[model samples]
Target chain A: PAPLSTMQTALMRLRTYHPSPIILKPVEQAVNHAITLVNTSPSSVVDALCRSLAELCLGLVQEAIDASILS
Target chain B: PAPLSTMQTALMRLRTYHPSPIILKPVEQAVNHAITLVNTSPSSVVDALCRSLAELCLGLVQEAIDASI
Candidate 1:
């Protein structure tokens, strides 16, 4: 499997653990955007994509905290 | 000002929430790798970087589950 496939697996696992639409929807949207970036952008844009992905992931951590899932 | 700067802020926020070195080290290492990829890789590699970052984040979630911290 490819990296994208691995990412999908990770997303599935995340859903299995979280299962909250509030969290899932934005994450899914961001991931879709990331996919689009990969398909459309040039190599120079990799930095932006990386930052965006990192930010989104960090945002998830914050979401977990807000939900009191992690303290 | 840039996306990287924003990521650093987000990372700082994450540390605020979960201060454990056990959780932070790997995540920090992964993020550093993401930065390195951005600096060195071509656009074609974005997909791989995206996946790697996603997997790392998901792993962090798993770590949280295990630590119960």
Candidate 2:
């Protein structure tokens, strides 16, 4: 696993999963969980990170398209 | 520069700027241009990468709000 860039670190901090807290918590927890594992079982964390990120991105797309940012 | 992660690599490839190509091209070009300079001029590229990425993401957000994507 590559070391995270400072920019990547800041980006992750700024990232919000979704506007809906119900959906948001789990997604954020999953990434935080994966980050814990990232130091030990890095490969799985890679897959986990990608899956979580892609899922969140689409969710964001849907929210933006539907609720005018609140959605 | 830290090596780009596979996820980051793929994310970069999938990234688009504004749906407006006019905006898209310059953002893409700036990134590509930084990528070119990254090997020799890594420090500035780091700044470029961060600024360009932040700009693109905001652009994407604006596009998503406006378009049906």
Candidate 3:
């Protein structure tokens, strides 16, 4: 479970999951949630973070290929 | 430099600046370059990392609109 870089932070932030609030909310929440966990301890922080991130990410890919960014 | 998360790792890997390998290469190189640095100390690690990442990002973007991934 790697930590996100600032650029990544920016990328995530700048990205618009807005159109697909339902789909995107989870991603945003997941990232924010994982980040919160991250503050506790590095070792314990990432598993949940990665999981949430990957899921949101895969979802994004699904959206992209399917043009579901806003479905 | 923020830690390069697994997903970001994957995205960076999966990505391609095929036509403009230079543009993308710098970005990737900068990122990889930073990861190594991150091993040192979070503070020291991220500055160089952020600098390189930022530079490369701007470069790619310059190509974009004009074109980008």
Candidate 4:
């Protein structure tokens, strides 16, 4: 089996838990802002946005897998 | 625009939030159980499982959309 990372292990366990989403907002907003900036900003700015964007995107995808709908 | 429901709105807002996943375990377990049951159980049992399965599935999609890793 593929070795899962610590976060992945935690995320796998997430199917059983339900935590608040408050902390992710700022990062989400940052992502949104980065999205807006990517098209108009300089290459460096675009590059700068890539890290968090990738981080959050990858992070969120995994999060979604174990995540649930609002009640 | 299509009328967004309360939960959908909340889920939309959820893109910004990063809640814990502690609460989703039971429902997820139930879903796994239902999946197993659906394949072998009678029509009545299948129907019952379908309800939760559908509800949870739909809920999770929206959650996923508004959700993060």
| Residues B1-69 of candidate 2: C-alpha lDDT, one tens digit per residue | 443232234235435423444334433443443344344444432443434344344445444455554
lDDT, residue A14, candidate 1: 57
Question: Per-residue alpha-carbon lDDT of model 3 for A5-69, expressed as tens digits?
Answer: 43245336436534244334434443453344345434422443343344335444444545454
Alpha-carbon TM-score of each model against the true structure:
0.44, 0.32, 0.34, 0.29
Q: Model 2: per-residue lDDT, tens digit, A2-65?
A: 4223223423543543344433443344344334434444443244343434433444444445
lDDT of 3 at A7: 25
Model 1 agreement with the true structure over A1-71: per-residue lDDT tens digits: 44444445555555655645544664565456555555666343433443444444454555556667545
Residue B13, model 1: lDDT of 56
Model 3 lDDT tens row, B1-69: 243554244335436434344324433543454454345435532443344344334333344435343
Docking class of 2: incorrect
Q: lDDT per residue, candidate 4, A1-71, as tens digits?
A: 11113323333343234333442332233334334434443244234334423433344455556444433
**Each candidate's clash count:** 1, 0, 4, 26
- What's the TM for model 3? 0.34
DockQ for each candidate?
0.06, 0.03, 0.03, 0.02
* Arranged by TM-score, best first: 1, 3, 2, 4
Q: Please give, for residues B29-57, the per-residue lDDT of candidate 4 as tens digits.
A: 33343344344432443343344234333
Interface CA RMSD, all predictions: 9.3, 13.9, 13.5, 18.5
* List of chain A TM-scores, every candidate: 0.52, 0.50, 0.52, 0.42
Real contacts retained, model 2? 0.00
Indicate which candidate wins on TM-score: 1
Question: Model 3 chain B, poorest ten-residue lDDT window?
Answer: B17-26
Model 1 chain A lowest lDDT segment of ten? A42-51
Once model 1 is optimally superposed onto the true structure by TM-score, how far is the C-alpha of residue A22 displaced, in angstroms?
Answer: 6.0
